[PDB]
Design an enzyme around this catalytic site. Structure first.
Site, PDB file in Angstrom:
ATOM      1  N   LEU A 132       0.741  -1.200  -0.110  1.00  0.00           N
ATOM      2  CA  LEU A 132      -0.158   0.057  -0.044  1.00  0.00           C
ATOM      3  C   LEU A 132       1.049   1.636   0.236  1.00  0.00           C
ATOM      4  O   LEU A 132       0.327   1.696  -1.290  1.00  0.00           O
ATOM      5  CB  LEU A 132      -0.879  -0.131   1.228  1.00  0.00           C
ATOM      6  N   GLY A 144      10.634   1.422   5.266  1.00  0.00           N
ATOM      7  CA  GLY A 144       9.026   0.355   6.077  1.00  0.00           C
ATOM      8  C   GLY A 144       8.052   1.041   5.412  1.00  0.00           C
ATOM      9  O   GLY A 144       8.433   1.312   3.845  1.00  0.00           O
ATOM     10  N   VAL A 173       3.454  -0.631   4.566  1.00  0.00           N
ATOM     11  CA  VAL A 173       2.672  -1.714   4.729  1.00  0.00           C
ATOM     12  C   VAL A 173       1.965  -1.624   3.919  1.00  0.00           C
ATOM     13  O   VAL A 173       2.278  -1.124   2.234  1.00  0.00           O
ATOM     14  CB  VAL A 173       1.371   0.282   4.986  1.00  0.00           C
ATOM     15  N   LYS A 181       2.554  -3.789   8.750  1.00  0.00           N
ATOM     16  CA  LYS A 181       3.136  -2.508   8.601  1.00  0.00           C
ATOM     17  C   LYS A 181       4.416  -3.289   9.275  1.00  0.00           C
ATOM     18  O   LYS A 181       5.257  -3.723  10.250  1.00  0.00           O
ATOM     19  CB  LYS A 181       2.675  -0.946   9.642  1.00  0.00           C
ATOM     20  N   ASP A 191       1.591  14.824  12.875  1.00  0.00           N
ATOM     21  CA  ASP A 191       1.353  14.932  11.237  1.00  0.00           C
ATOM     22  C   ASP A 191       0.310  15.002  10.995  1.00  0.00           C
ATOM     23  O   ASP A 191       0.011  13.723   9.979  1.00  0.00           O
ATOM     24  CB  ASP A 191       2.489  14.308  10.945  1.00  0.00           C
ATOM     25  N   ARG A 227      -2.799  13.382   4.278  1.00  0.00           N
ATOM     26  CA  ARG A 227      -2.169  11.727   3.871  1.00  0.00           C
ATOM     27  C   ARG A 227      -2.144  11.694   4.654  1.00  0.00           C
ATOM     28  O   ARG A 227      -1.903  10.115   4.677  1.00  0.00           O
ATOM     29  CB  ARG A 227      -0.997  12.505   3.017  1.00  0.00           C
ATOM     30  N   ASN A 228      -2.050  12.055   5.523  1.00  0.00           N
ATOM     31  CA  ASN A 228      -2.741  10.773   7.277  1.00  0.00           C
ATOM     32  C   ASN A 228      -3.946  10.518   7.701  1.00  0.00           C
ATOM     33  O   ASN A 228      -3.872  10.089   8.577  1.00  0.00           O
ATOM     34  CB  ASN A 228      -1.395  11.259   8.060  1.00  0.00           C
ATOM     35  N   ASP A 271      -1.642   7.505  10.469  1.00  0.00           N
ATOM     36  CA  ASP A 271      -0.264   7.784  10.396  1.00  0.00           C
ATOM     37  C   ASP A 271       0.828   7.008   9.479  1.00  0.00           C
ATOM     38  O   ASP A 271       1.110   5.630  10.227  1.00  0.00           O
ATOM     39  CB  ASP A 271       0.838   8.591  11.482  1.00  0.00           C
TER      40      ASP A 271
HETATM   41  C1  LIG Z   1      -2.148   5.016   7.742  1.00  0.00           C
HETATM   42  C2  LIG Z   1      -1.360   4.219   8.547  1.00  0.00           C
HETATM   43  N1  LIG Z   1      -1.312   4.466   9.691  1.00  0.00           N
HETATM   44  C3  LIG Z   1      -1.770   3.994  10.815  1.00  0.00           C
HETATM   45  C4  LIG Z   1      -0.725   4.219  12.176  1.00  0.00           C
HETATM   46  C5  LIG Z   1      -2.279   4.800  12.711  1.00  0.00           C
HETATM   47  N2  LIG Z   1      -2.004   5.477  13.888  1.00  0.00           N
HETATM   48  C6  LIG Z   1      -0.533   5.453  14.759  1.00  0.00           C
HETATM   49  N3  LIG Z   1      -0.695   6.360  15.523  1.00  0.00           N
HETATM   50  C7  LIG Z   1      -1.659   6.451  16.575  1.00  0.00           C
HETATM   51  C8  LIG Z   1      -1.231   7.163  17.977  1.00  0.00           C
HETATM   52  C9  LIG Z   1      -1.887   8.121  15.909  1.00  0.00           C
HETATM   53  N4  LIG Z   1       0.455   5.004  13.728  1.00  0.00           N
HETATM   54  C10 LIG Z   1       1.539   4.721  14.868  1.00  0.00           C
HETATM   55  C11 LIG Z   1       0.574   4.384  12.561  1.00  0.00           C
HETATM   56  O1  LIG Z   1       1.138   3.523  12.187  1.00  0.00           O
HETATM   57  C12 LIG Z   1      -0.192   2.442  10.472  1.00  0.00           C
HETATM   58  C13 LIG Z   1      -0.995   1.898   8.622  1.00  0.00           C
HETATM   59  C14 LIG Z   1      -1.629   3.001   8.465  1.00  0.00           C
HETATM   60  O2  LIG Z   1      -1.261   2.525   6.786  1.00  0.00           O
HETATM   61  C15 LIG Z   1      -2.455   2.088   6.288  1.00  0.00           C
HETATM   62  C16 LIG Z   1      -3.663   1.657   7.281  1.00  0.00           C
HETATM   63  C17 LIG Z   1      -4.924   1.706   6.235  1.00  0.00           C
HETATM   64  N5  LIG Z   1      -5.877   1.613   5.369  1.00  0.00           N
HETATM   65  C18 LIG Z   1      -4.257   2.241   4.335  1.00  0.00           C
HETATM   66  C19 LIG Z   1      -4.220   2.009   2.447  1.00  0.00           C
HETATM   67  C20 LIG Z   1      -3.493   2.409   1.920  1.00  0.00           C
HETATM   68  N6  LIG Z   1      -3.996   2.212   1.021  1.00  0.00           N
HETATM   69  N7  LIG Z   1      -5.079   1.942   1.380  1.00  0.00           N
HETATM   70  C21 LIG Z   1      -5.575   1.431  -0.471  1.00  0.00           C
HETATM   71  C22 LIG Z   1      -5.550   1.525   2.180  1.00  0.00           C
HETATM   72  C23 LIG Z   1      -2.804   2.051   5.184  1.00  0.00           C
END
Ligand SMILES: Cc1nc(-c2cnc(NC(C)C)n(C)c2=O)ccc1Oc1ccnc(-c2cnn(C)c2)c1
Length: 287
Positions: free
Chosen positions: A22, A28, A30, A50, A152, A156-157, A170
């Site tokens: 993704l 790193g 995802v 991740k 952040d 985009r997040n 994030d």
């Molecule tokens: C965006 C994202 N965020 C995190 C994450 C969130 N929250 C925190 N922390 C809090 C405390 C704020 N942290 C540390 C993180 O790492 C984990 C993985 C992740 O990726 C994704 C997730 C879902 N869907 C997709 C995607 C991409 N394309 N499609 C079609 C779907 C990607």
């Protein structure tokens, strides 16, 4: 973070069947995956995993664990990217979160606009932007209740899932910020300057209200349909001076006067004077 990790989140890594990547950072990424027997209901689900790439270092291993430890102690809210499980034993660390169907908010907004201009050979309504804004506000207000500083906040997040519901997330180590034009060089680290509050750029201080500032920039992105903040303005010493002296972006094309007023409130020079996410939420639920 820097505290014992609970084992309730552990998940068998051989019960993940990986799909397309993704997002991918420098060290790193995802990846989408199907997880079998996850949760109490033993649900079979598409998830986001991740993980660190082959270029593995000690400092990069801690960064993924810190993100996991904060998410574990955090809790569940509908408008944040929830943690589903982790794989900490038996190999490389894997962080399993929900899978959001429509990707980040920035590309969704930028594509829908292009699709809405199709007569230059569903549509997005103003209500939709107010729901996106309301939903992220609810997520941020939930993080603010746990003393968890995003630092952040940007479209985009922000991710969209089933029913086009907005979730604050994030990508962290899984975004190639090394080559991202929204992250500017500032010595030891690359920083999303155009989203940052002035006191975070100069005093290097991050609080709930510094996220409120960046949320204000997010509102500007949502109601411009994916425009870049401070467009055409190069990040240099003049830009820093303008921001510290009180310079604010003009009203975006699609924001009502009172949405732009809420943007300006998030962009107050004094942090205590900015609105809280609870106040932003409650206001945006009305609209
Ligand atoms: C965006 C994202 N965020 C995190 C994450 C969130 N929250 C925190 N922390 C809090 C405390 C704020 N942290 C540390 C993180 O790492 C984990 C993985 C992740 O990726 C994704 C997730 C879902 N869907 C997709 C995607 C991409 N394309 N499609 C079609 C779907 C990607």
């Amino acid at each position: 973070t820097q505290l014992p990790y609970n084992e309730k989140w552990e998940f068998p890594r051989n019960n993940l069947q990986f799909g397309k990547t993704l997002g991918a950072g420098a060290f790193g990424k995802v990846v989408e995956a199907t997880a079998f027997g996850l949760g109490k209901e033993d649900a079979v689900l598409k998830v986001a995993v991740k993980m660190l790439k082959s270029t593995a270092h000690a400092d990069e291993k801690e960064a993924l664990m810190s993100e996991l430890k904060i998410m574990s102690h955090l809790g569940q809210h509908e408008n944040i990217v929830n943690l589903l499980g982790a794989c900490t034993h038996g190999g490389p660390v894997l962080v399993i979160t929900e899978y959001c169907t429509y990707g980040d908010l920035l590309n969704f907004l930028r594509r829908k606009a292009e699709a809405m201009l199709g007569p230059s050979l569903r549509p997005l309504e103003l209500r939709d932007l107010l729901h996106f804004s309301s939903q992220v506000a609810q997520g941020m207000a939930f993080l603010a209740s746990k003393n968890c500083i995003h630092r952040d906040v940007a479209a985009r997040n922000v991710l969209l899932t089933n029913g086009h519901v907005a979730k604050i997330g994030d990508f962290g180590l899984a975004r190639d910020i090394m080559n991202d034009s929204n992250y500017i060089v500032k010595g030891n680290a690359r920083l999303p300057v155009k989203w940052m509050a002035p006191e975070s750029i100069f005093d290097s201080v991050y609080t709930v209200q510094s996220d409120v500032w960046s949320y204000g920039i997010l509102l500007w992105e949502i109601f411009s349909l994916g425009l870049n903040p401070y467009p055409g303005i190069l990040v240099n010493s003049k830009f820093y001076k303008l921001v510290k002296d009180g310079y604010q972006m003009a009203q975006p094309a699609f924001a009502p006067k009172n949405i732009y007023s809420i943007m300006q409130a998030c962009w107050a020079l004094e942090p205590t004077h900015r609105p809280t996410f609870q106040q932003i939420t409650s206001f945006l639920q009305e609209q």
